[PDB]
Design a protein around this nucleic acid. Structure first.
Lengths: 324, 93, 322, 93, 325, 322
DNA sequence: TTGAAAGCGACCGCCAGGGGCACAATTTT
DNA sequence: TTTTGTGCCCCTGGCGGTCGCTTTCAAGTT
């Protein structure tokens, strides 16, 4: 069990009569000519824009290996899929669960459990509420409907966002989360950041062979990717919210965010290019505090959550969300 | 729909950029016949994708271009002696 | 309007807005032939040529499918652009897969649209066993009774050929993946490259290829395509070959190397495709429309038509020829 | 009846003559727009007086030209940006 | 169809293997040699007596190109014409009829009938109540000699010109027309138009092969051509005479004339160049030919009436002159 | 009285303060200026293609002076005509005389008298009849109809050309006159020479303001310029026939006349260029007959002008004899 | 035996005007 | 104290594109 990942746009892949040979450039020479076999791979990932021999695809697609193309940042552009993929069973369970609310419900409770637990586990990280936290989670699995829950998302968020002014300071002001247009500068970064999470998630879905536009919590309409937004929730509290507070004790201030132009607060292009510096740095961490697996970045951690979810649907597996 | 286009632009390094980039462009929308000439058979939406690229790119106070719009029955009558006749097929190699 | 590529030694790069193919003929061993964008709606790769990743992000910002094939023509996969966002559609596509009565009242149409095209083809080619075996289908009440029928009509469809071709070629049997006979190789060629135009029409209608109505999707194969691909398997790839073996590509080609393998020569594969675009450059009356709609477009239509059968509830009258 | 024509020809002392002599001609039958370009609006019989002049002088193994025939409703839509559009009145000085 | 005009008396025309090159600058440079085509042209007019290459002239007449000469003022002086027509039989009847006045009369009554009508039907275009003239128009038909008639045209002309000031307005003054130098500016403008009108007429005769010097009104005994003036008469009142009133209601109201050494109200340069714009504009007109639906331009109607006239002479056809209401 | 002529294409003509200025230049020379008055002139002649001041035309054309353009050889191209001219009475007498046979006849008798005397006086130049000869002449003037005469030219020509066979020799052969096509070399030079005379005559007529297509002897058909051929007759025997016999005793040979290709007898371009050397040489000389200078080329311009005066002024037309 | 895009900064086939210096005659009815 | 077109050179010069060269790389506007 493994898969292939490539970050450097300096990599060429060739075939050696039945197997691959990676040729990296590796500043200071041609370091790491490491070849790799098959029979461990079932998925491939190209992140930057490296060159590839077509001889690899025509060898890769005779056996069922998806090939994905992204940006050095992880933004999705497209993927090359073969004939013989087993994602039909997936889309069925993906649907059979959409019409089996017990599955849909036993699922939605997890995405939320994985979001709200992260908030207390953040406020204990960003010391705000108290010593032992453990609040209103284990409260959720003890429910039996959706409207009982969707009100909870609205509750904890309203309970979650009013605790910020005390946590940010006086340089900035925050009353609540405001979608487009952002009436507060901060709310724009989330409307911005929640977008930068969409990309790394919008990629994970196409890898699992999932239909992003088919979800379980976010009711499908208007062409909205609900299979994505169901996932962004468990990360909205840990990735978009941890970065923002990580730069606002060191970085960007009113000096950069446009002053009320037509009511909005847009950014300067000289801050947009700085915003990511801590953002992609974040996507190089995650010791997975439970020793369960040391080796996992946040950026990659999602690919698993999706792959974990497919198996929840194809193999009947559990979906234990990601926390702290 | 057959859009024929011309450009004759100075040798200033401030415009040769605009020319040589434009040569690289029309090869993206059509075929080459003469140095200052491309033949572009194409649809309309493909045009605004293009026209909006020129109005966004040219200094007409120093540039010179003319364009001609050609329908089939006015193409049938076109004449050449040293070059082949127009076509717009699917490509094979 | 379409692009074809044969050589696995050609590297493709992107220019400001246009493509450059690099052919290495060893008198200089490299030759950049410029290529336009913005006119194309489809690409097909036969060999296994090199591609810049930087280029697709330029092709798929344009609505450009990318298709991959083998020297033999067998279909392997395709890389597609921005995906449709009509979920409500794909549910009905599924809400019907588990209601077989819905699935049933459908497959009877696909077949009615296949066999009528065959008998109307053999009369097109000149011959007369299949109109009985034909509306018969309606006289069925389950699926498994029916799927065996296609194999019968198919075996009844292929053994009736030698009489129409002549003596130069032979057909007793046919293996899908194995090219035991050249024509059998052309099927994996045509049947393989036919998915290309079909694998795209679904991406426009937003359908999920992996969910079908005839081919149960519990085989890891997109059945929404093959359930659909049948209506055209008999009309474009089977009619094209029979028009080109009329004075074109007869023998002298089709190398016998690799016992059990009959590949083609280059410049014959390049000649083969011209007739494929001939068919895709050949309009028809479309009895219910009576004057328009080339073959290439008819497929995109059937898909959009099919979605409406599911969301708008209209009839799906398959394609029928006389 | 609006004949637009092009020439794109090498720098041969045997063909460079053909270019510069041809420019001496087209200024006689029509107006100048670009280096390799003349736009000639004129009648028909005036054509054979012309057609008979080029077919009578060229080396097709080394020369290159194409021709376009443009009527008014095809002329009006020749949008331009840096040059004016064609017209053909009586001339005054 | 695309005519050429020349004002500058320092312009030279040479031939470059098939075409013309004009040289203007006059030693503030290299003469600003501007190329010109001929193979599209059908007529030329020269006013400032410019210099021309003789080697070039012989190229225009290998093309069928008349050459006309005028003065800064616009008076007609002469013209050089290309290869002529070879129909003597035509020119004989042109004469065999000239000495039988019975034929001459049945003709001139038409020229004038088609001319004086052209005036009254013109004054109604301009909005004039009566200017009693149709009586005078149809008077002619009750005449049977020439001397009876020449006094009449002068009368209708005098009746035509006294209705002039009221039709112009107050900015200008006009009581009558003088064969003099143009003691009046406008009459100079007429000598300009009436002078340059021979240009398109002097050619049409050369097309039909007619002898300009044998006419029916102007007896060719003053050395003046007559098929031109006999024909030119039908057009003085509606094309050059309607044109002037077309520019003096919008343009060149004043300030654009010059008087010198005689009064001699000459025109200003750069005003002449606007004058002709309307003249070729006028000759780019359609008017639908109010006999049939021909829709011929004025420019062609002259070539037509002339060719038509030969047929009156060889084929016996009727000559219905041009009348417009 | 005098008129103006210009031969050199190296001449500039200007107007200087109310009068003319001719500016010549030549071999071992330069601007060789000469002022000129008006009021003596009635015509101007430009022979080559010299440059001319436009300011001069407007002084000539405000003045009543026609201006003619030719080639150094005398071929007519065009002429510049003013408003005023005394050519109407001319064209009238030219016509009034075509219908008064007494004028037409008493005229035609002169053209013929001026033709036969030149030929009988030609054979006396080359000495064939040797006779005091009487030329039969006066026979023509004492006639009373035309048809009696038009048959006569046919007689003298048959009498005139049969006396050449003895006059040339055996190197060439001549029995009679064969116009287009000749098929005989000599007959071509006359059909050639008789053609090149049309040019200088075709020019002389346009100076007199005459209609060439209205004649007195040659009946006016086909747009046939009878006014030219009526004049050409008196010179056919003196310019084309003396020139031919002037060169066929020196240089021209069948080697220079191309032989029967399909029907024709054309020359080589290397003989055509030589033909003129003696031809224009001849047009540069004559004495007179009243002693008075005249080139042959000029002698014609007068004959036309005299003819107008025969018609406009009622003068005699005494034709040209040796 | 080393991955791609765009972006400059230089070598040759197209374009025209400009400046001198040999030329100069037509039918074939 | 002035001079007509038709080629056949060089050369100065405003066009037109290819070939061969150092820095780029990352993005939503919920």
């Amino acid at each position: 069990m493994s898969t292939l990942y490539l970050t450097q746009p300096d990599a060429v892949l060739s075939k050696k009569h039945e197997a691959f040979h990676v040729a990296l450039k590796q500043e200071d020479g041609s370091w790491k000519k490491q070849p790799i076999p098959a029979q461990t791979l079932e998925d491939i990932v190209l992140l930057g824009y490296p060159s590839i021999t077509g001889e690899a695809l025509g060898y890769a697609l005779e056996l069922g290996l998806p090939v994905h193309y992204l940006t050095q940042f992880g933004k999705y552009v497209g993927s090359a899929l073969p004939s013989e993929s087993r994602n039909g069973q997936l889309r069925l369970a993906q649907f059979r669960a959409h019409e089996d609310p017990i599955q849909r419900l036993d699922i939605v409770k997890a995405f939320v459990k994985g979001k709200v637990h992260n908030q207390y586990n953040l406020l204990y990280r960003r010391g705000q509420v108290d010593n032992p936290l453990k609040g209103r989670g284990k409260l959720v699995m003890r429910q039996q409907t959706l409207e009982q829950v969707r009100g909870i998302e609205g509750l904890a968020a309203r309970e979650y966002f009013a605790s910020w002014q005390e946590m940010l300071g006086h340089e900035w002001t925050f009353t609540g989360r405001f979608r487009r247009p952002p009436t507060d500068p901060v709310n724009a970064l989330l409307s911005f950041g929640y977008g930068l999470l969409r990309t790394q998630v919008t990629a994970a879905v196409h890898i699992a062979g999932l239909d992003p536009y088919i979800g379980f919590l976010h009711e499908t309409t208007r062409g909205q990717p609900a299979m994505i937004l169901d996932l962004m929730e468990e990360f909205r509290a840990l990735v978009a919210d941890s970065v923002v507070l990580t730069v606002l004790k060191q970085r960007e201030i009113q000096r950069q965010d446009f002053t009320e132009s037509l009511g909005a607060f847009r950014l300067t292009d000289s801050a947009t290019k700085t915003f990511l510096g801590a953002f992609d740095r974040k996507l190089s961490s995650e010791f997975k505090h439970p020793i369960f697996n040391y080796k996992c970045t946040y950026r990659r951690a999602i690919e698993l959550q999706a792959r974990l979810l497919a198996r929840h649907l194809q193999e009947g597996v559990v979906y234990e969300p990601l926390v702290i | 729909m057959l859009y024929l286009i011309i450009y004759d632009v100075p040798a200033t390094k401030a415009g040769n950029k605009r020319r040589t980039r434009l040569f690289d462009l029309l090869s993206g929308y059509g075929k080459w016949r003469q140095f200052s000439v491309f033949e572009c058979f194409l649809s309309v939406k493909q045009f605004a994708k293009l026209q909006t690229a020129m109005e966004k790119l040219i200094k007409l106070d120093e540039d010179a271009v003319c364009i001609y719009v050609l329908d089939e029955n006015t193409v049938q009558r076109t004449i050449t002696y040293g070059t082949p006749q127009p076509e717009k097929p699917g490509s094979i190699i």
